[PDB]
Structures are given as structure tokens and as C-alpha cells.
Amino acid sequence: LPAPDDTGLQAVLHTALSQGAPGAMVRVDDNGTIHQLSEGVADRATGRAITTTDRFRVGSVTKSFSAVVLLQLVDEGKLDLDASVNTYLPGLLPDDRITVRQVMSHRSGLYDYTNDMFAQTVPGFESVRNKVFSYQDLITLSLKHGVTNAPGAAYSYSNTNFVVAGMLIEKLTGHSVATEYQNRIFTPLNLTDTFYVHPDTVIPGTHANGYLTPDEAGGALVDSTEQTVSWAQSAGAVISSTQDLDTFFSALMSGQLMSAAQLAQMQQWTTVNSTQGYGLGLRRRDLSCGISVYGHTGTVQGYYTYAFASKDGKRSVTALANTSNNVNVLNTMARTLESAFCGKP
């Protein structure tokens, strides 16, 4: 790979601040040489600087943790990717042709309940932030709508899929997802900044606060740090750090977290758009210089995350801005992947 471009990374972060992120940061693990940059504030009311060791909410990056646990169950013979979801969760879904592989690749047709929830950004956050939902509650919300396509037939990203994933982990293992994450991922990789504390609202230790951008242009930011994330759970509630997400995607892509057979199933790409794919709880992004990287993005109120690694895991990048509902910042933060993998133009 080209060398990571720290001046390019610096410009990306500075642009994200100019577009309304209070803070923005990035950590590259380049085959044992670290790059770390941050600009702006973790807490905009006190002025405390953001830094690459601050913990934060990773949002939908959680789906990759869920998928690693499910693929280890596949390795253990407890789960078959091509079995019906209802084989393990009887009568859960209206159609038995919905399979575990279609759920994990967003090909199931299940309606995303969060489209009910967040049609208005701050009112929807204020609705869910202090609620505790069961898995079944969220599935029932989805099922008020019919499916959006035939099973397997179309890519349609849906949080519901990874709510099903959490129910499957808990049903098959008899343990909570927190326990399975801890035992199969956080402890073995020594992810000391990584937690799943649902439904607690506190982020343990020093963290970035999250600032939700309101729908009204120019409106005051809303502190969204503390919430249950119960509307997402196994689809979105993990807390981590840039070092720990680098560690995690490096371990995944270098083959440390499941058999080679299952990693190969995880990387069977469904087309998302002309420069992206979706595997099993895993994203592929195609970068301008002709390299692809592998990992996941997250959007949770107040926090945008990108966490991607090269195919062999030897270079990993995690970028965080502590705002959300700000598509200028979301698009700018994607540019950290170009600077960190493609290097100087």
C-alpha cells in the first residue's frame, strides 16, 4: 500500500469541523506504525479536546460483532446459514423462506422499524432514547409493515435483520449478547475500551460526547451522549475506541475470528451500489485508487463511525466524528479512507 497521507487526513478532519462536527478523529494502524489525528472537542460545552483514545458509540459497526458471533455458531454446527430463521425462532417471521444468510446480508425484505422512529430526527431521538425494548418488540414493529421484497431478492439495509441476529444468538447460546460478545470477541482480543452495557445509558470511562444535528438548519446541537440504544441492541449498541475497532477488523480480515470457510461466506458480496458491497454483517468499499477495504460504518445519534481494514488486515483505519444527522460531515469523514489507504494524490 501507499503510505497513509497525514496532511490529507488533517484536511479531512478540519473540513468536518468546518461543516459542524464539534470533534473529528482518525487512527490508522499501518502494519505496526500508528497514525493518529484529532481536531476539535469531545465536549463542546466544556471545551475538552477530542482524542483518539476517547470511547464512543460505534452504531451499526455492532452488526460486524453480531455477525462474528453468528459465524462462530456456524463453525460450531449450531446454525446453518441457509436454514430458515423460523427453524430456530418458530413463528417469528411471516415467511419461512427467510433464511439466516438473507438476514445477515440485508436481503430478507424485513422492513426497517427505525424508519417509523426517526422520520423526525430530534423528536425520534427523544422518543427512543430512554426506552427499553425487547427484541420481540422491535420485530413486531417491523412486522406491522409487509416485507419490501421477496426473500433474498434485493439488498435493502434493515436494522431488523440484526435484531433477528441478536435473538438468534441469545436463543442458540442461552446467553445474553453481552456475554457472547465478551467471551468470543472482547476478551480474546483484549478490547479494553469495548463494551455492550445495554440498557445502561452511561458510557464508561473517558468518552466523546455525541451532538445530534437538528433537522432545522442552523439549530442548536442536542447532546445525545446518553441513551439506551435499545432500539438497536445487536444492530447498534456497542461502545468502543479507534484502537479497538482497528484491532477487531484487523483480526477479522487476517483470519483470527472464525474458520476460513466462514470468513469466505462473510465476504460473499451483495451489490450495494457501484462501489460497495455487503457480505454477512460486513461492508466492502472500493476506493479511488483501485483498492477495496472491508469493515462497517455506523450512524447513531451524535456519532459517525467508519472502521475498515485492508484485505489481509495489515492496515486498519477507524474515523469518528461526534455529530450525526449531518450528511456534509458524513461524506467528508469517508474521505479518511482515501487518505489512509490511497495516500497522497
158 is in an annotated binding site: yes
**Hey, what's the cell of 77?**
454446527
Report the 10 Å Cβ neighbour count for 310: 23
Q: How far apart, in whole angstroms, are the C-alpha atoms of residue 154 and residue 266?
A: 17
299 is in an annotated binding site: yes
Q: How long is the chain?
A: 345
Strand pairing of 283-286 and 33-40? unpaired
The helix/strand count (H/E) of the chain reads as: 12, 13
Kindly report the CA angle at 4 between 284 and 54, in degrees rounded to 5?
Answer: 80
270 is in an annotated binding site: no
120 is in an annotated binding site: yes
Q: How far is CA 149 from CA 95, 165, 198, 265, 291, in A?
A: 12, 19, 31, 23, 32
Residues of the chain by 3-state class (helix, strand, coil), percent to 5: 35, 20, 45
From the candidates 18, 38, 60, 292, which is the catalytic residue? Answer: 60
Q: How far apart, in whole angstroms, are the C-alpha atoms of residue 145 and residue 102?
A: 18
CA dihedral 215, 220, 226, 227 (to 10 degrees): -20
Half-sphere exposure of 123 (CA within 13 A, CB side): 7
213 is in an annotated binding site: no
Euclidean distance between the first and the last CA atom of the chain, given in angstroms as a whole number: 13
324 is in an annotated binding site: yes
134 is in an annotated binding site: no
46 is in an annotated binding site: no
Q: How far apart, in whole angstroms, are the C-alpha atoms of residue 94 and residue 335?
A: 41
Q: How far apart, in whole angstroms, are the C-alpha atoms of residue 297 and residue 318?
A: 10
325 is in an annotated binding site: yes
- Three-class SS state of 247: helix
283 is in an annotated binding site: yes
**Hey, what's the cell of 71?**
459465524
Q: How far apart, in whole angstroms, are the C-alpha atoms of residue 213 and residue 209?
A: 13
Whose grid coordinates read 461543516? Answer: 19
Query: Catalytic: 274?
Result: no
Indicate the annotated binding residues for substrate. Answer: 118-121, 157-159, 283, 297-299, 324-325
Residues serving a catalytic function are 60
Indicate the annotated binding residues. Answer: 118-121, 157-159, 283, 297-299, 324-325
